Amino acid sequence: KVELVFVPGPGIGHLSTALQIADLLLRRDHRLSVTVLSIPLPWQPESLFPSSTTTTTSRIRFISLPQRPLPGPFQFQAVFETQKQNVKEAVAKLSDSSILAGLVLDMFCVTMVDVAKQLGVPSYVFFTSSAGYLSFTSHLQDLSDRHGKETQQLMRSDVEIAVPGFTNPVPGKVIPGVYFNKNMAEWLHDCARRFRETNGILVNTFSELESQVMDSFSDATAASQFPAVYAVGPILSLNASSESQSGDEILKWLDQQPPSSVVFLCFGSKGSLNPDQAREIAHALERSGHRFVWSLRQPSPKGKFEKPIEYDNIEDVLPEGFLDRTAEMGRVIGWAPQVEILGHPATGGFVSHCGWNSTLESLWYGVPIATWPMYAEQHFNAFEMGVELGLAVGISSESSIGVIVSAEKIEEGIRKLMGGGEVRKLVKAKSEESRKSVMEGGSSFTSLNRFIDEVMK
Amino acid sequence: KVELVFVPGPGIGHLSTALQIADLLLRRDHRLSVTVLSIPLPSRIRFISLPQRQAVFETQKQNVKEAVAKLSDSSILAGLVLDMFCVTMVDVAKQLGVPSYVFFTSSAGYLSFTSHLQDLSDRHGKETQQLMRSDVEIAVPGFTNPVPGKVIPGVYFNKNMAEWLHDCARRFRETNGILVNTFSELESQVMDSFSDATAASQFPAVYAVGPILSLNAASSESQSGDEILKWLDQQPPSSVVFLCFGSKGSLNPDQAREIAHALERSGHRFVWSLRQPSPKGKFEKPIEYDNIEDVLPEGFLDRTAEMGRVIGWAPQVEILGHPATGGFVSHCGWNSTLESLWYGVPIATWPMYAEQHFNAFEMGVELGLAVGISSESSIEEGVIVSAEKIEEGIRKLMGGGGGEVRKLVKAKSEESRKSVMEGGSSFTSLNRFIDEVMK
Numbered sequence: 014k015v016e017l018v019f020v021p022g023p024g025i026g027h028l029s030t031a032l033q034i035a036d037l038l039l040r041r042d043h044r045l046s047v048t049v050l051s052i053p054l055p056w057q058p059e060s061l062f063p064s065s066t067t068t069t070t071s072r073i074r075f076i077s078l079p080q081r082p083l084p085g086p087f088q089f090q091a092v093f094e095t096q097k098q099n100v101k102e103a104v105a106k107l108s109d110s111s112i113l114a115g116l117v118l119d120m121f122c123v124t125m126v127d128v129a130k131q132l133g134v135p136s137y138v139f140f141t142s143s144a145g146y147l148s149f150t151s152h153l154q155d156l157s158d159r160h161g162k163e164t165q166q167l168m169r170s171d172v173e174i175a176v177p178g179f180t181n182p183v184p185g186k187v188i189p190g191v192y193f194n195k196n197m198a199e200w201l202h203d204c205a206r207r208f209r210e211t212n213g214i215l216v217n218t219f220s221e222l223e224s225q226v227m228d229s230f231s232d233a234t235a236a237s238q239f240p241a242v243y244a245v246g247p248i249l250s251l252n253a254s255s256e257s258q259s260g261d262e263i264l265k266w267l268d269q270q271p272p273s274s275v276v277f278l279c280f281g282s283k284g285s286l287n288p289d290q291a292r293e294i295a296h297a298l299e300r301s302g303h304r305f306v307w308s309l310r311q312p313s314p315k316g317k318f319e320k321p322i323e324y325d326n327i328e329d330v331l332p333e334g335f336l337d338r339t340a341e342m343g344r345v346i347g348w349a350p351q352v353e354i355l356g357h358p359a360t361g362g363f364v365s366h367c368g369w370n371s372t373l374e375s376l377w378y379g380v381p382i383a384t385w386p387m388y389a390e391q392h393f394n395a396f397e398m399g400v401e402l403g404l405a406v407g408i409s410s411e412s413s414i415g416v417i418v419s420a421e422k423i424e425e426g427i428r429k430l431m432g433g434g435e436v437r438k439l440v441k442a443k444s445e446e447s448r449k450s451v452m453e454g455g456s457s458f459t460s461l462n463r464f465i466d467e468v469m470k
Numbered sequence: 471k472v473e474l475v476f477v478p479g480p481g482i483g484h485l486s487t488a489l490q491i492a493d494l495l496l497r498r499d500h501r502l503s504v505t506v507l508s509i510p511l512p513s514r515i516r517f518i519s520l521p522q523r524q525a526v527f528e529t530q531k532q533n534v535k536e537a538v539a540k541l542s543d544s545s546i547l548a549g550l551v552l553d554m555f556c557v558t559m560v561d562v563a564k565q566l567g568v569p570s571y572v573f574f575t576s577s578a579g580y581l582s583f584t585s586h587l588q589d590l591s592d593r594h595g596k597e598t599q600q601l602m603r604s605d606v607e608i609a610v611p612g613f614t615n616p617v618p619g620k621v622i623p624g625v626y627f628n629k630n631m632a633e634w635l636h637d638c639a640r641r642f643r644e645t646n647g648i649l650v651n652t653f654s655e656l657e658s659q660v661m662d663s664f665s666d667a668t669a670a671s672q673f674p675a676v677y678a679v680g681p682i683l684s685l686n687a688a689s690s691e692s693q694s695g696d697e698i699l700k701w702l703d704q705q706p707p708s709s710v711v712f713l714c715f716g717s718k719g720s721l722n723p724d725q726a727r728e729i730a731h732a733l734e735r736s737g738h739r740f741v742w743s744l745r746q747p748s749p750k751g752k753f754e755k756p757i758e759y760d761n762i763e764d765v766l767p768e769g770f771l772d773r774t775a776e777m778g779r780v781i782g783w784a785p786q787v788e789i790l791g792h793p794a795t796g797g798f799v800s801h802c803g804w805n806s807t808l809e810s811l812w813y814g815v816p817i818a819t820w821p822m823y824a825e826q827h828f829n830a831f832e833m834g835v836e837l838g839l840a841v842g843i844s845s846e847s848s849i850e851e852g853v854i855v856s857a858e859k860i861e862e863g864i865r866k867l868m869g870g871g872g873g874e875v876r877k878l879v880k881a882k883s884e885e886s887r888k889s890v891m892e893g894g895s896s897f898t899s900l901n902r903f904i905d906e907v908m909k
C-alpha cells in the first residue's frame with residue numbers, strides 16, 4: 014500500500030480544490046492511495062469528492078483530526094499550530110500500514126512541513142495561487158533574509174522590484190497589504206522558507222499562462238536553488254437552499270439574454286461593498302447601458318475578518334428607484350453561482366476582485382476580466398493579468414496595497430471591458446490553451462504525470 | 471523541440487508496431503517530436519528514407535549516424551529507439567553522445583530467453599546449437615517451468631546466425647532502456663525478474679508499455695475481407711473458428727487437405743486463411759492457391775459452402791474483434807497473440823517460424839492461456855499435423871456445454887484493456903519512459 018496524505022487548507026474552497034487533485038492523482042495511477050486529514054475549526058469532507066466509482070473511492074480515506082483547545086489575524090494559523098502533534102501521530106500511524114510516499118500540504122498548512130521532516134517523509138506543497146505569486150512571495154522572503162530588505166520598506170510608490178520570471182518591474186504598491194504588519198510579514202516569509210524545504214510544489218496554473226515564470230523555476234530547480242515546481246492546473250470546482258434557488262432564478266434570467274451581453278460583478282468569498290461604494294457601482298451600471306448580474310454583499314458587523322452577509326434592505330441602500338429603472342436590464346444578488354454564470358453563453362465580461370480561482374474560472378470560460386483587487390494578493394494578481402500578461406483591464410484602480418472608486422471610473426472600466434476588442438481576442442486564445450493543457454499530452458497533464466512518477470520512486 | 475529518432479525493423483509486425491508507439495508517444499506528450507529513419511530492403515512526425523546501398527543494417531550505420539547528427543542541429547536529440555534487429559546502431563548512439571533504447575516487439579519472456587541464451591554462450595563456450603535437443607531444459611529467468619531446448623528458435627541452429635543474434639542481445643544490455651510490447655499483468659514473473667536485475671544494476675530498465683496494436687484505399691483484398699465481415703455479421707456469437715498463419719506462414723497441399731478434413735469433421739463454422747509458399751523462396755510473400763477445388767479434398771468447398779469461407783490475406787484484427795469469432799488457430803506470432811488477447815479470443819497454437827514455438831510454450835505451458843495442437847520442435851521441418859490433432863485442438867477451443875480456458879482469457883483480456891488506459895501498468899510505465907526522455 015502506497016499512501017499520499019493530504020492536509021487541505023481552511024475552507025470548502027480549499028478542500029474542494031484539494032479533493033479535485035486527489036481524484037486526479039488516483040485516476041492517473043492505480044497504485045496510489047490517498048488519506049485526507051481534516052482540521053476542525055471550533056466555530057462533511059467526503060461529500061466534495063468527485064468519483065462515484067469504487068475503483069477510486071476504495072483508495073481514499075478521510076480522517077477528521079481530534080479537536081483541540083487554545084485561546085484575530087492569526088486565528089486559523091493558531092488552530093493549525095495546535096494540530097501539528099495530531100498530524101504527526103496520524104501520519105506515523107498510517108506509515109505502520111503503508112509506504113508513506115508523502116505529505117501534501119496546502120500552502121497555508123506548511124507549518125506541517127516540520128512533521129514530515131521529523132518523520133523522514135517527503136513533503137509537497139499544493140500552492141493554490143499563481144506561479145507568479147509563488148515567485149513574488151519567495152523573492153520577498155529572499156530579499157529580507159539575504160539582503161536585509163524588510164518588506165515594509167519596499168511598500169512605496171517609488172519602489173520597483175525585479176521578480177524572477179517577470180519582464181515588467183513589480184511595483185512595491187502591489188505587495189500584499191498585510192506585509193506592513195511585522196508579525197504577519199514574518200509569518201508569510203516563514204511560509205516561503207518552508208516551501209523551499211519541500212520535495213516539490215504543485216501550482217494551480219498552466220505553464221502557457223505563466224511561461225516565463227515557469228521557465229525561471231525550471232532553471233532554478235536545475236541549479237538546485239528551488240524545489241521542482243509542477244504546473245498542474247487549472248484545477249477547478251465546476252460541478253435545496255434559497256441561495257441555490259436564487260441562483261436558478263439568475264440562470265433562468267440569463268437564458269433569455271443575448272450572447273456575451275451581460276457584465277457579471279462578483280468579489281470572492283470575503284469581499285464586500287460598503288453602501289457608498291455600492292451606490293457608485295449602481296450609478297455606473299445604470300449609466301453604462303449594459304446588462305448586468307451584480308453580486309452584492311455587506312461587510313459583517315462587529316468583525317472585519319468575519320464572513321460577509323446580504324443587505325437587509327437594498328432599496329434603502331441603493332439609489333432611489335435604481336431597482337425599478339434597471340428591472341429589465343439587470344439583477345442584484347447575494348452569493349452567486351459563479352461558475353454557472355461564467356460558463357453561461359450570455360455572460361460577456363467579469364468585474365472581478367482577481368482572486369486566483371476567479372481568475373482561472375474566467376479564463377476557462379473565456380470571459381475577459383476588468384480587475385478590482387481588494388485583499389490578499391489580488392493587487393499583484395491584477396498587475397500580472399493586466400500589465401504582464403495583457404489579458405485583463407483595470408477598473409480605474411490607482412489605489413494599490415479606504416478610498417472609493419467613483420462611478421466615472423467604474424463606467425470607464427466597463428466601457429473598456431465591453432466596448433478591448435483586442436484583449437477579448439487574447440482571452441479567447443488563452444482559454445483554448447487552458448482547456449488543452451489538462452487534456453492528454455498537454456503541459457499540465459504531463460506535469461502531473463511527472464509529479465506522480467517522482468512520488469512513486 | 472525534443473526529438474526521438476526511430477529506426478524500425480522489417481516486416482508488418484515490426485514496422486507497423488513502431489509507428490503505433492511513435493503515434494502514442496506523440497499523443498501522450500506534445501513536447502515530443504519523432505523522426506523515423508527507414509532502412510531500404512532488397513505535424514510532429516517526420517519520415518526519412520535512407521539512401522540505398524541481416525547485414526543490410528550494418529551498411530546503413532554511416533547513413534544513420536549522419537541523419538542523426540543532422541537532426542541534432544535543430545532539436546534536442548532525446549534518444550534513438552531501435553528495433554531488436556537494428557541494435558548495431560547502439561554504437562552510432564554511443565559515438566554521438568545520444569541515449570539509445572530498444573523497442574522490443576516480441577514478448578518480455580522472449581527478451582529474457584534470448585538474453586539468457588547469449589549469457590550461456592558467452593560464459594560457457596558451448597554453442598546454442600548444442601542445447602537444441604529433446605533432452606535439454608533451460609532455466610530462463612522469470613519462468614516457473616523449464617524452457618525446452620526444442621523451443622529455441624530454429625535460426626539458432628546456424629553458427630553465423632546464432633552469433634549475430636547473441637550480438638544483438640549483448641547490445642541490448644548497453645542501451646539506456648528497453649521498451650517491450652507487453653503488459654506486466656500478462657508476464658508478471660518475467661517483469662519482476664527484470665525489475666530485480668535492473669535494481670541490481672545488471673540490466674537496463676525494461677518498460678512494459680503494451681499492448682501496442684494496429685487496430686486502425688479500396689483494394690481487392692479489401693473487398694474479399696469486407697465480404698468475410700458481412701458473412702460473420704450473420705453468424706451466432708462465438709460460433710466461428712478463424713485460422714491464420716502470419717505474414718510468412720503458408721500451407722503445403724497435404725497439410726491443407728488435413729485441415730480441410732478436420733474442419734469438415736468438426737462441423738464448426740470457419741474462416742480459413744489459406745496461402746501457399748511463394749515459388750520464389752520463403753523470402754517472398756505467400757500467395758493464394760489457384761483452383762483450390764483441385765487441391766483440397768474433392769467436394770470440400772461444395773459441402774462447406776454455408777459453413778465457412780476460405781480466403782487469402784485476411785482482415786485479421788477485424789475478424790478477431792468480431793463477435794461471431796470464437797476461437798483462433800494461430801501461428802503464435804507475438805502481434806497475433808496480443809490481438810487475440812485484446813479481443814478475448816482464445817488461441818490454439820500452431821507455431822511455424824521465428825520464436826513462435828517459444829511463444830506457444832509461454833502462452834500454453836507457462837501462462838495457461840492457449841491450447842496446443844501438436845508437439846513439433848523448432849527444428850522439425852515437414853512433419854504433418856494430422857486432422858485428428860486439429861480436430862481435438864478445435865474441440866478444446868470451442869467446447870464446454872469446459873469453458874475454463876475461455877474464462878482465463880476473458881479475465882486476461884480485461885487486464886490488457888486496463889493496462890493501457892489512464893492509471894494502468896503500461897500507461898504509467900510509458901510515462902516513466904517519457905520522463906527519462908524529457909530529462
Ligand SMILES: O=c1ccn([C@@H]2O[C@H](COP(=O)(O)OP(=O)(O)O)[C@@H](O)[C@H]2O)c(=O)[nH]1
Pocket residue numbers: 026250279280281282283284308347348349350351352367368369370371372374
Ligand atoms: O458569490 C460568490 C463568490 C465566490 N464564489 C466562488 O468562490 C471562489 C472564490 O475564490 P477566489 O480565489 O477567486 O477568491 P477568494 O474567495 O479566495 O478571495 C471561486 O471558486 C468562485 O467561483 C462563488 O461561487 N460565489
Ligand SMILES: O=c1ccn([C@@H]2O[C@H](COP(=O)(O)OP(=O)(O)O)[C@@H](O)[C@H]2O)c(=O)[nH]1
Pocket residue numbers: 481482483684714715716717718719743782783784785786787802803804805806807809824
Ligand atoms: O492474413 C493475415 C495475416 C496477418 N495479419 C496481420 O499481420 C501481423 C502478423 O504479426 P505477427 O507478429 O503475429 O506474425 P509475423 O507476421 O511476424 O509472423 C498481425 O498484425 C496480423 O493481424 C493480417 O492482418 N492478415
